[model samples]
Target: MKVDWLFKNVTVIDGSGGPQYRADVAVKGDRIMAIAPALDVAAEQVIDGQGRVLAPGFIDVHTHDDINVIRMPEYLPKLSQGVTTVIVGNCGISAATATMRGEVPDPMNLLGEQQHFIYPTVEAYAHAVEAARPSLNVGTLIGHTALRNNHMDDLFRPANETEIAGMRVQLRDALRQGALGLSTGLAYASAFQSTTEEVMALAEELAAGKGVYTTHLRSEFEPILEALDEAFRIGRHGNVPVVVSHHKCAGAKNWGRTKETLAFFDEMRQQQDIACDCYPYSASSSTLDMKQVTDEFDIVITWSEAQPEQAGKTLQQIADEWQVSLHDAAARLMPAGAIYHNMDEQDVRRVMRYPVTMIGSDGLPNDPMPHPRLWGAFPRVLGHYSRDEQLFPLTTAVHKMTGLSAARFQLADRGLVKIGYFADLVLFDPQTVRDVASFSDPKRPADGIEAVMVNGVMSYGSDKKITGRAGRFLRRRM
Candidate 1:
């Protein structure tokens, strides 16, 4: 049979958390047309995947690349790492459907600047993404903080009756426009004032659609259990699945607490659909939060608005340099970005090993000095975790990023190397697939990712360049 591309002699993991098997796969227009041990396929391009592993492309379940996909269509940070799809509008900072009142609020700046917040509806965002034709598919969530910013005059308090009603109208409109669900960055100051009742009322809008409620919980610190309870209640109220973003136990006091959170996940999963996505690293990066400032753990400044010259220095380093207290230095770096080394490796391992845990880079693309996860998260999971340390089998690693993520997000027909699936696949040398990006020298492409195909188009290849673009605005599959 004829095909657009045929990959033969490949060890296929299939992204199903199963053992790998030797297979030959054929891709037609935009789907996997055939698969077998061997096939008599005459193809336009035949790749002898003799020394590589082939699997469905990885899905970045947590990303803040709301505007980058359009502003910077050549999104190499993800695509080069074999991530073919990214779920954006995560951590309650969607660019679309967010009627920004003024200067981009707190973490909303993480997505993009004020001018880029032009897409006031999911429909407008979808149109913009299609026009840009980014290298990977984008599925979005309507951000609760964005909605609050829309109607609430003061974010220092809960949304009053009329405010909730306004948000509900906008959320219902967005869901109708194909937004996947609602997400809340309850931990951020911009969202912290929002009460549980406020979030629950907003969640009520989700029950009517196939919407999923994903949240950056109210607290990843000591109050995590209470926060998890709030998330579960919101999900139950909305009748929607819940995905906890960057499911980590943060802060020095919170070390070794995944033991409790993962247990909570198991308990909650029994009653409703509860899952989460976490990046591979133990450190977390975001806009410099005074609440998260600490001397117990190293807080490296990625960018500082007030002290621009202090970028790339640790808060302690800046403190000692200028004869100031750590808190004083942190305060000076107002409206900046930071990487907090607050997690213990032991806790991170337990969370990553959890059965329901999916992989998300949680990579901040807008940061001047972005975390290494931006360029290396998926490959790090495959090489460092799966191959080097044997933290899990290679198949399990692929499954977490692909099959599990797709299933949890309800993204259909695109996360497995199966017949009739969307031809989103990645070929890599299993032996050499290691992340090249590191904390010191980030923005490096991953090694051994041979090729990436999105919708049967070779979007990236071994030559370390973009070949073609066939990505789509993956609207919620209703």
Candidate 2:
């Protein structure tokens, strides 16, 4: 058979968390056509894989790229790391199916300004994504906070029956329009006031579509167990799968609680579908919160609308320089973004090594000083965690970001190198693959990601160039 491209002498990991084997892979059109010890077919492009690893392209399952995908279609930060797909509208802040009265509320602002949110319907958003043609495929979740913002005048109170009915209509429409499912940022003040009943009502829409429910839990601190139960309860109510986004035990006091949390997750899994995604780093980044400001750990301000000059300064340093309290300094940096070095390294490893946990960058693309994970998460997992730290084999590392993620998110016909699967693949020198980006310099691309292909198109090369943009606005199969 005629082929579009072929890889010779490649070590195929195949993204199944299995052992790697040598194979010559062939791609025809947008699907992998064959994989054998050798393929004697002609191809437009033949790649000498040099016995390097050929695996499914990474899928970022947690992201705030609702606007970034449309505005910056190149998606270099993700494409450069071998990410071929991204699940947007995570943490209860999607830009789709939303109508805002004024400036977007807190945390939602992390997405973009008021004008950037022009997609009043999920259909519009999906159409816009196709129009923009991002370098990485996009699947989205309908944010619960976004629903509340559209119908609720007071975000600090539970929605009334009338409001609930209105939000339900929009959510049901979004689900029909190809949203993966519902997501709630119950931890954020914007959605924190929502009663369990409120979310349950909205999630009922997911059941009809056979969609998943992903969440930024109500709390990851002392009350995390309760939060986990709450997530499980909603999933049970909706009868949909549950994805605990960026699962972590935050705060010094909550450092080692992943042991307990994973145990709880295991027990719950028997009754319902439960899984999670976590970034590779020990630190977490998000919008600055006065409630989270403290001296217990270092917190660096990534971007502050009010104090732009303090972009990369630690909160403590800023306070000391200003001769003010940390809380006061935090207050001064309102509407800002921060990186909290609050997680225990051991906790990060514990959660990441879990069988059901997938890898997600949780990268805030809009931040000027974004976390290093934006550019390095997938590579960091392959190079640092799996290769250097020996947390897991390279095959397992690839699965966490590819096959495991695609399965969890229900991304069809992708994330594996089997014949007939979509040709979303990455070639990397496993021996030399490593993240070059750091907290100090967060925008640099990773090292040794030799080539990336999306939908059978060679999209990115380690030569610091984007060869093509062939990403699709992938719709959820209902």
Which candidate gets the maximum lDDT versus the true structure?
2
Span of ten consecutive residues with least summed lDDT in model 2: 202-211
List of clashing residue pairs for candidate 2: none
Clash count per candidate: 0, 0
Candidate 1 clash figure, as a count: 0
lDDT of 1 at 94: 93
* lDDT string, candidate 1, 129-169, tens digits: 99998889999999998999999887879778999989989
- Candidates' RMSD to native: 2.1, 2.2
Question: Which lDDT value does model 1 have at 393?
Answer: 95
Q: After superposition, how far is residue 94 of candidate 1 from its true place, in Å?
A: 0.8
- lDDT tens digits, residues 1-478, model 2? 6789999999999998999999999999899999999999899999999759999989999988999998899999999999999999988999988787877897788888998889898789989999998888999999889899899887999889999999888888887777888889998899888999999998888885457899999998999999999999999997888999999888999989899999999899999989999999999887898888989999988788998988788998999999999999988889898889999999999999999999999987877778999999999999999989999999999999999988877788988999989999999999889999888789998998999999999999979788888989888875
Residue-level error in angstroms, candidate 2, position 293 = 3.3
lDDT of 2 at 226: 98
